[PDB]
């Protein structure tokens, strides 16, 4: 239907398993008639570092540079670097934002971490006050589509890595929910490097198949209990 | 004595509160006679992105780029980029690695996330298999010194942000413990931007005091129970 989707994609190799997941999302959401944009961060050589090059006008406090303060002001003044505001426009217009990435150290690859750090600035994505359920991106859906080295077995409460939900907290709750997104259940594609060719094909078609009905899903309850239980 | 400390620091501003915490750690550990090295990531313009530039000469599969495989082989064949190997030398010789950074999105700034992604490579920090305590950095101590925007009250189990310990999991357990580090209790300096003056002087003083007996400390039990349990 009449919806805009932004896919923020973080993998170096177009032939990868992540590449395939990205392309099947674009294929399926495009088939449905959705408007689809992809920010392919490596191909863009997206700048991950939060630096004073991100503000182009007079700083509030040139004596002691505080990145959150300076970017909050710059956002209000329209003196942010244009790579940041280009991304903000995509997010602003999106109804759904999908993040497609390999798990790096229980988190996103740094190039995508730098997208969150630099694009979700104060004034745009949240304000103090104006976060979690009062976040500035309220009304928008977000979803993490994550691939791993580790097996599903390894990511259980009594497996070596602990439950997969534990590493989702800082991203789902600390970032997405904080900015006001409603979070859809994560898509985790476990261990495609270990998986057989039939199992890989299965994981790709499960994602394609889930996307056929993605607009009918409810968000998760993004709370400590969902993530950690008890 | 004789101990070597590496401090991996990630703040843009030498006059910041992180800056002061890094400086008192250098001052105190230097005073004790320890060997100290600092990796000032922003001043080094450290590269955060995981790309094929990290491998010199020629790829072990130039048709499909797999970062994990390529860096593992590059490590074995002494063909990693020199920014990464310079960091690996400092880590290899270190008895204690302290990370000094402001919390960005429940995690490390992207520039320090990229140090983790690119420096802690397979063959160096862990093997597959070969992790947690068959992790290659066993014997070394690691410590997170983190500063926050949010007050300690916000970081309680039924505060908005949830417990501090919940966001420590991917860093302490998924990264530091996985590589074989023993983890010291984190130093968390809550909300300096809204502290006095005193209080702030006091937080800087307390870190210095703690570093006086850092070598007497016992590592935390780095378990799901410690982070999430009761
Ligand atoms: C710095 C670093 C940190 C990491 N940290 C962690 C961690 O904390 N936890 C953890 O679990 N893992 C971790 N990993 C490993 C893991 O997340 C990755 O290896 C990744 O998830 C695998 O995804 P990929 O797309 O790169 O796989 P690929 O290697 O690209 O996929 C396996 C492939 O199937 C492919 N394929 C592509 N398209 C298709 C298709 N359409 N159908 C069938 N097969 C297809 C390829 O041909 C290849 O055989 C880390 C890796 C690195 C480099
Ligand atoms: C992209 C981004 C994401 C963020 N995400 C989060 C998050 O997830 N959770 C969260 O809680 N917060 C978050 N924050 C807020 C961030 O963690 C805090 O802004 C930061 O930790 C403050 O530390 P600082 O060193 O920059 O403080 P500074 O602004 O540098 O310091 C505060 C004050 O201390 C003064 N000072 C310096 N040295 C001394 C000294 N020796 N004695 C006394 N005073 C001194 C400085 O002059 C200044 O007045 C985020 C910020 C950004 C920009
Ligand atoms: C430290 O987290 C990991 C957990 C983990 O379970 N696996 C399988 C990893 C992996 C890597 C790199 C890291 C991890 O390359 C291939 O498999
Ligand atoms: C989870 O993210 C935050 C939690 C949080 O508790 N606080 C206070 C934050 C903050 C930021 C940015 C993010 C956060 O700028 C100043 O204060
Ligand atoms: Zn939440
Ligand atoms: Zn652990």
Judging by the overall fold, what is the CATH architecture of chain A? 3-Layer(aba) Sandwich
User: Count of helical segments of chain A?
Assistant: 7
What fraction, in percent, of the residue positions of chain A are helical?
A: 25-40%
Could you tell me which chain pair has the largest interface and how many residues each side has?
A: A-B, 51 and 51 residues
Query: In CATH, what is the class of chain A?
Result: Alpha Beta
Distinct bound molecules:
flavin-adenine dinucleotide, 6-methoxy-9-methyl[1,3]dioxolo[4,5-h]quinolin-8(9H)-one, zinc ion
How many structural domains of chain A? 1
Number of strands of chain A: 6
Globally, the shape of chain A reads globular
- In quaternary terms, these chains amount to homodimer
Largest sheet descriptor of chain A:
6 strands, parallel
Instruction: Indicate the proportion of strand residues of chain A.
Output: 5-15%
CATH topology grouping of chain A: Rossmann fold
CA radius of gyration of chain A: 18 Å
The CATH superfamily title of chain A:
Flavodoxin domain
End-to-end gap of chain A: 39 Å
* Structural class computed from helices and strand pairing of chain A: alpha/beta
Notes on the structure:
The structure is a homodimer of 230-residue chains. By secondary structure, chain A is of the alpha/beta class. The first copy, chain A, has a single domain (1-230), classed as Flavodoxin domain (Rossmann fold). In chain A, 36% of the residues lie in helices and 13% in strands. Chain A has helices at 17-31, 67-77, 82-93, 110-119, 164-177, 197-212, 224-228; strands at 4-9, 35-40, 96-102, 141-147, 182-183, 187-189. At the A-B interface, α4, α5 and α7 of A face α4, α5 and α7 of B. Bound molecules: flavin-adenine dinucleotide (FAD) (2 copies), 6-methoxy-9-methyl[1,3]dioxolo[4,5-h]quinolin-8(9H)-one (2 copies) and zinc ion (2 copies). One flavin-adenine dinucleotide sits between chains B (11, 13, 15-18, 20, 102-106, 147-150, 192-193, 200-201, 204) and A (50, 64, 66-68, 117, 174).
């Amino acid at each position: 239907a009449g919806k805009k989707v932004l896919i923020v994609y973080a993998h170096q190799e177009p032939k990868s398993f992540n590449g395939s997941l990205k392309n099947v999302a674009v294929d399926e959401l495009s088939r449905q008639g959705c408007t689809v944009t992809v920010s392919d961060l490596y191909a863009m050589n997206f700048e991950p570092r939060a630096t004073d090059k991100d503000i182009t006008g007079t700083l509030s406090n040139p004596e002691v540079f505080n990145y959150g303060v300076e970017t909050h002001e710059a956002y209000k003044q329209r003196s942010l670097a244009s790579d940041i505001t280009d991304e903000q426009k995509k997010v602003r217009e999106a109804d759904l934002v999908i993040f497609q990435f390999p798990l790096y150290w229980f988190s996103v690859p740094a190039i995508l971490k730098g997208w969150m750090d630099r694009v979700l600035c104060q004034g745009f994505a949240f304000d103090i006050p104006g976060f979690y359920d009062s976040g500035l991106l309220q009304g928008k859906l977000a979803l993490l589509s994550v691939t791993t080295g580790g097996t599903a077995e390894m990511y259980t409460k009594t497996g070596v890595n602990g439950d997969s939900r534990y590493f989702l907290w800082p991203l789902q709750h600390g970032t997405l929910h904080f900015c006001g997104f409603k979070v859809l259940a994560p898509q985790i594609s476990f261990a495609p490097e270990i998986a057989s060719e039939e199992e890989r094909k299965g994981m790709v078609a499960a994602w394609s198949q889930r996307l056929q009905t993605i607009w009918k899903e409810e968000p998760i309850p993004c709370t400590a209990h969902w993530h950690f239980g008890q």
